[PDB]
From a paper:
CC chemokine ligands (CCL) comprise 8-14 kDa chemotactic cytokines (chemokines) involved in diverse immune functions. Extensive structural analyses reveal that most chemokines share a common core structure: an N-terminal extension followed by a 310 helical turn, an anti-parallel three-stranded β-sheet, and an α-helix. CC chemokines also readily dimerize, primarily through the formation of an anti-parallel β-sheet at their N-termini. Certain chemokines, e.g. CCL3, CCL4, and CCL5 form polydisperse, high MW reversible polymers in excess of 600 kDa without the assistance of GAG.
Mutation of Proline 8 to alanine (P8A) profoundly reduces the polymerization of CCL3 and CCL4. CCL3 P8A crystallized in space group P6222. There are five CCL3 molecules in each asymmetric unit. CCL3 P8A still arranges as a polymer structure similar to wild type CCL3; each dimer rotates 36° to bind to the adjacent dimer such that a decamer completes a 180° turn. However, the N-termini of CCL3 P8A exhibit substantial heterogeneity, indicating that these N termini are more disordered than wild type CCL3 and can adopt multiple conformations. One such conformation results in the loss of a hydrogen bond between D6 and S33 in CCL3 P8A. This disrupts a key contact between CCL3 dimers. The loss of contact between CCL3 dimers and the conformational disorder of CCL3 N-termini likely contribute to the decreased stability of the CCL3 polymer, leading to depolymerization. In the CCL3 structure, however, the P8A substitution disrupts crucial contacts between CCL3 dimers to reduce the formation of CCL3 polymers without affecting the dimer formation of CCL3.
Residue numbers in the entry:
A (entry chain A), B (entry chain A): 2 to 69
The structure:
Amino acid sequence: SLAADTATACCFSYTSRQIPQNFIADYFETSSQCSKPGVIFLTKRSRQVCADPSEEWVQKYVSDLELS
Amino acid sequence: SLAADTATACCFSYTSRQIPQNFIADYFETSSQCSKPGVIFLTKRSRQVCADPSEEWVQKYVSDLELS
């Protein structure tokens, strides 16, 4: 099940404060074509939050999502 | 009326063939932070189409949208 082609989402700035984990609904990695490495978190209320893939809390949140 | 911050849409490739103009519903210019200059057209069926801002048919479609 492939996705219809579409503009690419990119992160040009990261959130400076960690999101409460109970807000997190999903995540996905941004394209490498983008200027900066990126993790976009999706909240329960469908807010998009750009995050630094190198930060530990980001890596933790991603891991918790993947292993459940 | 400002917009909630969000991942930035970017175009990393342009459509190679011109869209039928009666398909076009709206347009917007992509951020300059993006790698490439971009016009994203939005079709009646909400398809997103990346287009080269330098091409004449793109400039024409944008003009027709702006002046109506």
